[PDB]
Design a protein around this ligand. Structure first.
Ligand SMILES: [Ca+2]
Length: 314
């Protein structure tokens, strides 16, 4: 995809036995030139870099000091952790969306930071605070966190996001501002139909005339007791209805489970999917049962069957 470019690398031929600094929650990846970059949850948005995409090293962060406008949306926030970023490349600019919120509340706001390049060595490197994208107050029936941008086949950028409450939301973005028009309609596209509504961290990709919505089911942030599961559904239209393998709509708890974790890597969640030629990778974090259940970066090749459904190799 033009907005998540990786060149001519072949993900299927690579060894994904990662090493280095791998602690990470809700990681996303981008490649510029010969450098790989991971952005994840943490103080001012944490950054990791790699030469090959296998050996990772912690670098700095996007915001050394948090913008004052956050307080207008989340006055109660007392720490500097920004959550689940999303990265895309468009018109020579890198758009980094992130979440500003407080655990358990829907008084949240998704912000946008842009940069001309991802390489700090370049004179043009500067993460600019481009303000709020969309927000939720306690009166809203949705939570404005966990953003993901996807450009449909027709070149139209869309923003999906959401966590609990009414579920996964979808809204059109304008190409110029890369923000929703003031009167853009907000549409709900996935929900467990349960209470609490444990669905979040949406990620949409388009493959062979189909849009695939990956989401995280159940619970996070509990170490080895996390119950996260990665689920997926698809639709011919970006707006839905997204349905799973059994024909069940994702608005009614539908979703085909891609990974439920195991006894070594618990509760895999907050995924991202990238392509390069005929290859693809699934990126996510999982709790390390061998290291105090710390959120750990995971990258695995992602295949697709004859029916078009994705699956992880063994
Ligand atoms: Ca995400």
């Amino acid at each position: 995809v033009h907005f998540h470019p990786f060149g001519n690398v072949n993900f299927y031929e690579m060894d994904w036995s990662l090493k280095g600094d791998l602690w990470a929650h809700a990681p996303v990846i981008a490649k510029e030139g010969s450098r790989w970059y991971v952005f994840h949850t943490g103080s001012g948005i944490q950054i990791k870099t790699s030469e090959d995409g296998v050996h990772w090293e912690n670098m700095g962060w996007v915001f050394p000091s948090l913008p004052d406008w956050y307080k207008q949306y989340v006055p109660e926030k007392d720490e500097d952790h920004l959550w689940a970023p999303d990265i895309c490349f468009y018109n020579g600019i890198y758009y980094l969306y992130y979440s500003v919120s407080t655990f358990g509340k829907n008084t949240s706001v998704i912000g946008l930071a842009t940069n001309q390049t991802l390489d700090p060595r370049d004179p043009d490197y500067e993460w600019k605070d481009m303000g709020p994208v969309i927000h939720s107050t306690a009166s809203d029936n949705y939570n404005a966190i966990d953003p993901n941008v996807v450009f449909d086949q027709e070149g139209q950028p869309w923003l999906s996001f959401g966590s609990f409450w009414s579920g996964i939301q979808l809204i059109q973005l304008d190409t110029e501002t890369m923000k929703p028009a003031a009167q853009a309609e907000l549409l709900t596209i996935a929900s467990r139909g349960e209470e609490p509504n444990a669905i979040e961290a949406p990620f949409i990709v388009c493959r062979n005339g189909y849009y695939y919505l990956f989401v995280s089911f159940d619970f996070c942030c509990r170490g080895i007791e996390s119950t996260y599961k990665i689920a997926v559904g698809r639709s011919k239209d970006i707006t839905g209805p997204y349905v799973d393998k059994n024909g069940v709509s994702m608005m009614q708890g539908g979703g085909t489970i891609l990974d439920e974790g195991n006894d070594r890597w618990i509760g895999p969640g907050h995924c991202a999917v990238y392509f390069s030629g005929v290859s693809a990778i699934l990126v996510n974090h999982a709790y390390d049962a061998l290291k105090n259940g710390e959120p750990t970066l995971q990258i695995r090749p992602l295949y697709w069957d004859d029916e078009g459904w994705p699956y992880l190799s063994v």
